Amino acid sequence: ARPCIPKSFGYSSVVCVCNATYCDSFDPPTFPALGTFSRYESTRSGRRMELSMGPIQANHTGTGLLLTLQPEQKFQKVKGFGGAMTDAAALNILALSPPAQNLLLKSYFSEEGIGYNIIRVPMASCDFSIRTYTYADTPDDFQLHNFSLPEEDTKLKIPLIHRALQLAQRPVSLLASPWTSPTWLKTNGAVNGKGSLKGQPGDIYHQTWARYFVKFLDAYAEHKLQFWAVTAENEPSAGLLSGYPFQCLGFTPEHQRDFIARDLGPTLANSTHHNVRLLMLDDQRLLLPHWAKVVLTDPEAAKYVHGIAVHWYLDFLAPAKATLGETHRLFPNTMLFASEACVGKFWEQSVRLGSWDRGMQYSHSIITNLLYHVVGWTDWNLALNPEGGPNWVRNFVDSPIIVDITKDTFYKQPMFYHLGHFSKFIPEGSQRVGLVASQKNDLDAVALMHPDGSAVVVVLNRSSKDVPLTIKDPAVGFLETISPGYSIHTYLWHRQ
């Protein structure tokens, strides 16, 4: 294990500096006897996933907030955590020298880093691309004889995905999402703007677009990569907006329903890739529950939909209970998955190196999602440059890893450690369980049980004040602790 080398860039906290020969890392996981807990702590003052152990005791000395584990109250099982292998992320990673590349990929994907087990893969170009291609730009090729993967896939994304999977001990799930079709399949003949598929569900355009998903899965399978899931379209609502500035494809909820029922579901079902799951929406949660009602009340569509993918950036427009909570209530057997998280307030830089606030927004998001049935998370770009790019629209935003190619250096932002407090300690198949607060409080907290029955609890303090805290496990006893101002803690313990 090597500790964080901190650097300040004038924001509220530090980044951790990594280069070709040095990156902060953990020892292999090692858990103590019954009656002992492990605690990982990150603070604005600069602690970075620092490990301590202490006792779980029969006597309760705390007189403040008590959080009681309720392991018999069982909620959703976790699919996992990860991020997006965009053209931009791949270009940034591959501009580092190979030993620095390896330390960046280990940070995300190794047991000595934060244990990502999901990668989101754009199907061809998006805003985080240096140009505007699809896999079939040759027109009137309805059988897609001329479908092919460019350099962005075969040189940048695919090789990095292989390397991520080699580093990971956990099985990694790949999730694919398209931004645009070939422009010759669109009403507007453009990669962006207001435009849908030509014609109507079932026709040659819709069948060709469904066939494009299979050709994509075929091409990645030729490179020994298989997908867990695909989404029906990235942000289908974007392609209904006049002037939408980057790659999109517009679907009303009704057009998505009929595309899935008539074309995408049947085409995937008749392929060698019939085991690949299909997620719907892949868009802002303010569109719920309406979008879920329109698609999932049609059995011919609902039979092909595994889950509902949500994006975070317009979360402040619509509360979790009215969107995620009501959707679960109406469709309790259709999982919710967060497929795109994003941060970067119109008066701030795209990238703020060492922003504690942006880190707290990530952990607060993850806890709210877990409290409203969400089973997984994919962050957006795995890495960007210090401008938040490259992006062909200049739609610059923040990322948990910032690469400075000119110094063969990468910086791990507070966002990286806020994500890791979840991703490292919540493996696939973990189940959220009850955690009861004894009184009103300012903390964000969530409890889960590992597949082996061991406990994990995350506690976020977004306040400036230290909060004395007891955690009770009815089977073990009392963990007496403190949640410092501007801190995040992950607690782990055996229950027998």
Ligand X SMILES: *[C@@H]1O[C@H](CO)[C@@H](O[C@@H]2O[C@H](CO)[C@@H](O)[C@H](O)[C@H]2NC(C)=O)[C@H](O)[C@H]1NC(C)=O
Q: Which residues are catalytic?
A: 235, 340
Site membership for its own copies, residue 404 (CB under 8 A): no
**138, two tokens:** 């040759």
Q: Shortest CA distance to 219 belongs to which of 136, 109, 133?
A: 136
Closest CB to its own copies among residues 24, 283: 283
Using alpha carbons only, what angle is made at residue 287 by residues 215 and 210, rounded to the nearest 5 degrees?
Answer: 15
Can you tell me which of 241, 330, 436, 437 binds its own copies, judged by CB under 8 A? 241
Alpha-helical runs (H) found in 45-86 = none
Site membership for ligand NAG, residue 143 (CB under 6 A): no
Site string for ligand NAG, 96-135 (x = CB under 6 A): ----------------------------------------
Q: Shortest CA distance to 200 belongs to which of 141, 265, 259, 253?
A: 259
Q: How far apart are the first and last CA of the chain?
A: 28
Instruction: Decide: 57 and 477 in contact? Cβ < 8 Å.
Output: yes
Q: Which stretch binds ligand NAG (CB under 6 A): 33-41, 74-82, 138-146, 400-408?
A: 138-146
- Per the document, the length of the chain is 496
Beta carbon of residue 242, minimum distance to its own copies (angstroms, whole number): 6
Q: 5 is in the binding site of which of its own copies, ligand NAG, ligand X, none (Cβ under 5 to 8 A by kind)?
A: ligand X
Beta carbon of residue 21, minimum distance to its own copies (angstroms, whole number): 36
Q: Which stretch binds ligand X (CB under 6 A): 19-27, 78-86, 167-175, 344-352?
A: 19-27
Q: Rounded distance, CA 323 to CA 421, Å? A: 26
Q: 138 is in the binding site of which of ligand X, ligand NAG, its own copies, none (Cβ under 5 to 8 A by kind)?
A: ligand NAG
Residue 57: strand pairing partners? 478
Residue 446: strand pairing partners? 458
Beta carbon of residue 148, minimum distance to ligand NAG (angstroms, whole number): 7
Site membership for its own copies, residue 318 (CB under 8 A): yes
Q: Which residue has tokens 């029906």?
A: 232
Can you tell me which of 21, 52, 154, 166 binds ligand X, judged by CB under 6 A? 21
Written as one letter, the residue type at 360 is M
Residue 489: strand pairing partners? 41, 459
Can you tell me which of 8, 52, 146, 166 binds ligand NAG, judged by CB under 6 A? 146
**474, two tokens:** 């009815």
Closest CB to ligand X among residues 19, 102: 19
> What DSSP string describes 442-477?
SEEEEEEE-TTS-EEEEEEE-SSS-EEEEEEETTTE
Closest CB to ligand NAG among residues 99, 139: 139
Can you tell me which of 316, 333, 440, 496 binds its own copies, judged by CB under 8 A? 316
Site membership for its own copies, residue 137 (CB under 8 A): no
The whole-angstrom distance between residue 10's C-alpha and the CA centroid of its chain comes to 28
Q: Is 432 exposed, middle or buried (0-12, 13-18, 19+ CB in 10 A)?
A: buried
Beta carbon of residue 132, minimum distance to ligand NAG (angstroms, whole number): 15
Beta carbon of residue 228, minimum distance to its own copies (angstroms, whole number): 31
**Interface ranges with ligand X (CB under 6 A):** 5, 19, 21-22
Binding site for ligand NAG (CB under 6 A): 138, 145-146
- Which residues contribute to the site for its own copies (CB under 8 A)? 241-245, 286, 316-319, 322, 345, 347-348, 357, 393
